[PDB]
Swiss-Prot record, chains A, B:
Organism from which the protein derives: Arabidopsis thaliana
InterPro entries associated with the record: Acyl_CoA_acyltransferase, Diverse_Substrate_AcTransf, GNAT_dom
Gene behind this protein: NATA1
Entry EC no(s): 2.3.1.-
UniProt: acetyl-CoA binding residues: I125, F126, M127, R133, K134, G135, F136, G137, K138, N164, V165, N166, A167, Y171
Name the record gives this protein: L-ornithine N5-acetyltransferase NATA1
Pfam families from the UniProt entry: Acetyltransf_1
Amino acid sequence: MFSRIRLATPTDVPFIHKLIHQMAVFERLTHLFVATESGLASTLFNSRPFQAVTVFLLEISPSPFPTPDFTPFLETHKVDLPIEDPDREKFLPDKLNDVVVAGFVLFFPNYPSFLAKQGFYIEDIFMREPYRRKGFGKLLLTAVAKQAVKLGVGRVEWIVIDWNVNAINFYEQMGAQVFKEWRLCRLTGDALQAIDKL
Amino acid sequence: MFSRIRLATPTDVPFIHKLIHQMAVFERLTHLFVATESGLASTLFNSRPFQAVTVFLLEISPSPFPTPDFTPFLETHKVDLPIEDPDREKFLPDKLNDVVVAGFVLFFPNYPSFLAKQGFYIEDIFMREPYRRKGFGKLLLTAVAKQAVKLGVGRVEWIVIDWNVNAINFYEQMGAQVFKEWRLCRLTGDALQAIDKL
Ligand SMILES: CC(=O)SCCNC(=O)CCNC(=O)[C@H](O)C(C)(C)COP(=O)(O)OP(=O)(O)OC[C@H]1O[C@@H](n2cnc3c(N)ncnc32)[C@H](O)[C@@H]1OP(=O)(O)O
Ligand SMILES: CC(=O)SCCNC(=O)CCNC(=O)[C@H](O)C(C)(C)COP(=O)(O)OP(=O)(O)OC[C@H]1O[C@@H](n2cnc3c(N)ncnc32)[C@H](O)[C@@H]1OP(=O)(O)O
Ligand SMILES: [Ca+2]
Ligand SMILES: [Ca+2]
Ligand SMILES: [Ca+2]
């Protein structure tokens, strides 16, 4: 079984939208979800890949995939027993070919200022449920890491909520340092508007 | 006293460099500090202000300051006592004017994907020690917030380490939500290089 990691283009926004929604449901944050296709198309592609928000999609096929600062990551391995994907038809870029979008990673440049250089921050990493625990999720993280090297990015960072012990353990196994003694701070859209009123 | 918040340009790199170093010393992370003037100049200005890494400087004068997309935030207040700055001469953009760089805030676009829209992430906010607890630090945070509104950015976020009770309390008082149940994750430059091999 074969996989491909590629940059997302505007025609992928339906898939991104659906993946983000699935993530919100999984994380119990559906009430915060206001994203739309028009919204995503309106904001995801205002800069070059890797200059700002950037998305890799991971696609799977039983067949080999046929062939700017980027070439798609190809990889192949075995899976023990057959995948059962109820949402398969919702994740088909081209309805002819047996290529399914199984997950994504959404990231952007951050700036660890002690290094005086850009890093990458991973906002989202998500494998659809039928495709978890088969070695695909590590390919997504590895893709971001390898890309970072290719562009001389110094560091890759993200956060995780401590109820998500499975993701914590995944990250540990991937060789990530995990620092619990940080707190996430936020001025919401409403907090900002209130501050603006001064 | 009079204050001004403005965008940093390349000629400010010495001040930024020194402020970052002061922050590293304060945070007990000097061993991670590898930033140089050439490094900062090489990375801080490869994109338009607000498209990527962006820096505001806060400057203070006993005299009023000189009369697209950004205009400097001016403000005037009173200080209970005269300020004693031992490093004054290291933070003078011009030398003609009695204008001193007292702090900065370094931030960039993030992407809260449930909003399908950019936010701002504040990496660093720092007032030099002579200038703390006099109402200047809030002007820095307010500048980022007001700018976010002006550009229709949805959210402003950052993290804080839980030994830093003073900063935690500052943020709370500024109306920020503070979520302790998150952990910071990191693949270092060495972790990446290791992932790149094999
Ligand atoms: C909240 C935030 O800000 S960040 C986190 C965002 N949310 C998430 O990522 C969780 C969403 N739910 C999911 O299940 C995620 O899609 C995933 C990525 C964790 C799914 O798992 P995958 O990534 O496919 O795991 P993958 O198989 O690549 O794991 C790589 C290897 O690490 C190891 N590993 C995986 N999970 C674990 C675990 N829980 N404990 C220990 N080792 C593990 C295994 O050796 C695995 O190889 P395997 O295929 O033989 O199991
Ligand atoms: C994202 C990051 O970089 S996080 C970690 C680094 N950030 C830091 O803030 C730590 C660096 N060390 C410092 O001392 C910082 O320069 C600062 C920002 C805390 C300096 O303080 P300032 O920001 O100048 O404080 P400022 O005078 O603006 O305070 C504004 C209001 O906030 C509140 N406040 C300020 N400090 C505190 C405090 N220690 N406890 C409670 N409330 C406070 C008060 O209401 C204050 O008004 P008041 O003094 O009349 O009560
Ligand atoms: Ca996320
Ligand atoms: Ca910082
Ligand atoms: Ca924590």
